[PDB]
Amino acid sequence: ARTFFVGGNFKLNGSKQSIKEIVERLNTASIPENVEVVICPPATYLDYSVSLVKKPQVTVGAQNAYLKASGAFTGENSVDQIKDVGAKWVILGHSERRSYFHEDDKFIADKTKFALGQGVGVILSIGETLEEKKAGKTLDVVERQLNAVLEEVKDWTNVVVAYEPVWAIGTGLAATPEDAQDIHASIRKFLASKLGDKAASELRILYGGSANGSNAVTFKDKADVDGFLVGGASLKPEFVDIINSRN
Amino acid sequence: ARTFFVGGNFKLNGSKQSIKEIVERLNTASIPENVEVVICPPATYLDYSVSLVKKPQVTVGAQNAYLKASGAFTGENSVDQIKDVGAKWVILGHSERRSYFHEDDKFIADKTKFALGQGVGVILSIGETLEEKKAGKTLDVVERQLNAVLEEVKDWTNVVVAYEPVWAIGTGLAATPEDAQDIHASIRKFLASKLGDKAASELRILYGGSANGSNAVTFKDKADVDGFLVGGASLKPEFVDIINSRN
Ligand code: NA
């Protein structure tokens, strides 16, 4: 069975004190043995975050990295420096980077191949805009973004896909569980045609976009929804309730 | 007179072991009483670097930051998070960001205004390419880049300017101290016309080309060269010789 996966994207938020609060809560509150939790703080706090974790269910991820490990790339993060301080994952292709930071499908693909090759897992984000959805192109869009990665990446063992409707980000407007389920099923079937049935059956496809403590349990029986990429709620006590939503 | 300023841009290079050797070496080194040294490691190592610093003349800086302090900006660094960990500076407008990551002139200006308003110093990078130099565009380029910042910020008390002869990178040209002095003098004179004579006479203008332990001394008597923004030599023992180059 696909292990339930809950990622926490802090985005540009946090401090040493607030993150110490977040990690101590995870360390001391009841969470399942049967869960894979990955908290993704700002790069400034990756080292400190890893240093605080006291549950094996919880590891730390970066929110972005470059497609080279070293060199004259002032301002970038490196998967090697992520590993050096003990983190194990990176988010690649978040809509905020695709939209505001010029990261096209191929850049995301090249970064994904590179990260995986350096032994870092990838939380790969995909998702359609409200105009694209209204146009009926949700599947065409996520297939396109996935196709770019499929071009470069043959082995998805250490990839987790985060499907995030762009209009669902920061607006409080979550996809319905039925809709996310139908979409995840479609995505899984498309990936089966490329990666094969077994790989598609093992790949976690997460839902992201206004996921929170109240609505996480509404997704509990959606078979193709394997977890969440949590945004704002990952900074809050209810992140624990999301983690336990399939308890 | 203007205080000698030496910044060390690590770029995408470093590990916790490098950081320890580099900072402990600075801690016990004999350097001038009044030099101002800023080491700028990957964001991943900002926290750890500040924790190891004991030299009063040494502070820690980031290599880039966004133009807001918090929010839904996955993958970015924040000046408030830089401050939280005890760092004090940020490099903005490095040629590697202007080129590879499409950071436009106003983007740099908006970041500069924002960082200074948050109480973080700015190492403001400017510089023209080989193509621009060969077209006689050197001052048009730097004045454009500086004008964009001046549109947003006129109090440059907490700014140092780093001139990068991008035209000397890999091109088979070398920028000489004489070249540095001439361009710096022109830059200072332009900025006097915008900021006033007193501000311009206090502003540090750093040579941000290839400087090392061997050649840093050849800039020692150039009146308008007030220090360095050093690249690869930041990670090496000779970073100390650069700091001591005007003894
Ligand atoms: Na997210």
Author numbering:
A (entry chain A), B (entry chain B): 2 to 248
What's the publication's text?
In the family of triosephosphate isomerases (TIM) there is a strictly conserved cysteine, which is located near the end of the β-strand 5, forming part of the hydrophobic core of the (β/α)8 barrel-structure displayed by these enzymes. The sulfur atom of this invariant cysteine (Cys126, according to the sequence numbering of Saccharomyces cerevisiae TIM, ScTIM) is located at van der Waals distance from one of the oxygen atoms of the catalytic Glu165; yet, substitution of Cys126 by Ala or Ser only slightly affects the activity of ScTIM. Mutation of Cys126 has, on the other hand, sound effects on the stability of the native yeast TIM dimer. The structure of C126S ScTIM shows the canonical features conserved for this protein, with the common (β/α)8 TIM-barrel fold consisting of a barrel of eight β-strands surrounded by helices.
To find out what structural modifications occur in the molecule of yeast TIM when Ser replaces Cys126, we determined the crystal structure of the C126S mutant at 1.86 Å resolution. The structure showed the presence of the substrate analog 2-phosphoglycolate (PGA) in monomer A only. The electron density observed at the active site of monomer B did not account for an intact PGA; therefore, we interpreted this density as a sulfate ion and glycerol with occupancies of 1.0. It is important to mention that the catalytic loop or loop 6 presents a “closed” conformation in monomer A (with PGA), and the “open” conformation in monomer B, which contains glycerol and a sulfate ion, a situation that has been observed before for P. falciparum TIM in the presence of 2-phosphoglycerate (2PG). In our structure, PGA is bound to the catalytic site in monomer A with a tight hydrogen-bond network including NZ-Lys12, NE2-His95, OE2-Glu165, N-Gly171, N-Ser211, N-Gly232 and N-Gly233, which are structurally conserved among different structures. The main local changes around the mutation include the presence of several water molecules, not observed in the wild type enzyme (respectively). In monomer A two water molecules establish three hydrogen bonds with Ser126, whereas in monomer B three water molecules form four hydrogen bonds with this residue. In contrast, Cys126 in the wild-type protein interacts with a single water molecule. The key point seems to be that, due to its highly polar nature, the OH group of the Ser residue turns out from the interior of the β-barrel and, in its new environment, establishes hydrogen bonds with Glu165 and two water molecules. This new rotamer orientation apparently gives rise to penetration of additional water molecules that likely modify the polar/apolar nature of an interior region of the molecule. Furthermore, a long stretch of residues (Glu132-Val142), which becomes unstable, as indicated by MD simulations, may be the origin of the faster unfolding of the C126S mutant with respect to the wild-type Sc-TIM.
